[PDB]
């Protein structure tokens, strides 16, 4: 019956992870407005003919 309130009153709990990943983040969208051009050096120079 009688017991310190720092052992039983502390350990009478059940940890659950329902709250984990409850919310999300905005989906990727840069694909719809940009192309992917891989690079192999410090910079990329572009040139086109008129």
């Amino acid at each position: 019956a009688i017991i310190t309130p720092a052992l039983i009153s502390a350990l009478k709990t059940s940890f659950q992870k329902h709250f984990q990943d409850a919310l999300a983040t905005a989906p990727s969208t840069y694909l719809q407005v940009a192309t992917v051009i891989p690079s192999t050096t410090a910079s990329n120079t572009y040139g086109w003919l008129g």
Binding site: F19, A22, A24, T25
Partner: protein
């Protein structure tokens, strides 16, 4: 959340994470009704012993009362961060955010918008113990011999209402919900866009998708014109038609 990407200048700034916790304890509940032996045993009409089924349906209806009372009192009870679930001062890293709008002029009934799509819903409930009942219908009972009789019928239940993120929910805008304009569209699209414009700890959008609109029976007509009418008063479209599904409940206000 992991710290945001930074431009590499000099050394690195080693940052820290932020773990959060929510604690909530079970509560004890009971409803008990006492009658007399002579009353029931002299009841030849038979309109005095639906007590069993009345008590059963009361036990069944208790969770509705708990959850919707918590929804009502969301402006008073606190969420995990430290403020009220519906408060104007929800804290972000340096910033302050509000999820409750008032007018100080006309604030009568509050509609609620709940993005229930997420894995964790709003105003959750916890069920530690199912319902259990007991009677006093034998001679050997202490109550049966305490007076003429005390034929008590009671319920035992361990429950308590819970809540969740107090930024995914916007459930107090008592300004108005229906008019020719600026109440039908403004104060509803305002809630929708404010919830879709939330910012997480770190500087990332929350990606909120409001889908449920909860209103009392008195504001159902306003809610239905806001969502559920295809045309407009001038013959045009309602841009908010079929935007969110509305639910009418009588457990609030």
């Amino acid at each position: 959340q992991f710290p945001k990407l930074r431009e590499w200048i000099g050394q690195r700034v080693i940052k820290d994470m932020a773990a959060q916790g929510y604690q909530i304890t079970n509560k004890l509940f009971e409803s008990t009704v006492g009658v007399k032996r002579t009353d029931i045993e002299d009841d030849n009409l038979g309109v005095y012993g639906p007590l069993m089924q009345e008590m059963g349906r009361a036990a069944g209806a208790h969770p509705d009362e708990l959850v919707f009372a918590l929804l009502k009192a969301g402006n008073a009870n606190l969420c995990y961060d430290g403020q009220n679930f519906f408060d104007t001062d929800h804290p972000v890293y340096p910033n302050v955010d509000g999820t409750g709008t008032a007018t100080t002029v006309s604030n009568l009934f509050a509609p609620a918008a709940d993005p229930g799509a997420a894995w964790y819903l709003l105003d959750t409930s916890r069920s530690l113990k199912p319902l259990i009942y007991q009677e006093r219908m034998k001679p050997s009972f202490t109550s049966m011999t305490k007076e003429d009789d005390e034929q008590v019928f009671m319920a035992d239940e361990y429950r308590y209402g819970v809540r969740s993120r107090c930024n995914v929910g916007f459930g107090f805008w008592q300004l108005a919900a229906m008019s020719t304009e600026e109440l039908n569209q403004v104060n509803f699209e305002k809630v929708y866009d404010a919830m879709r414009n939330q910012k997480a700890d770190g500087g990332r959008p929350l990606d909120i998708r409001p889908n449920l609109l909860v209103v009392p029976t008195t504001l159902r007509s306003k809610a239905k014109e806001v969502v559920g009418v295809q045309r407009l008063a001038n013959g045009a479209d309602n841009p908010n038609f079929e935007l969110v599904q509305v639910l009418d409940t009588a457990w609030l206000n």
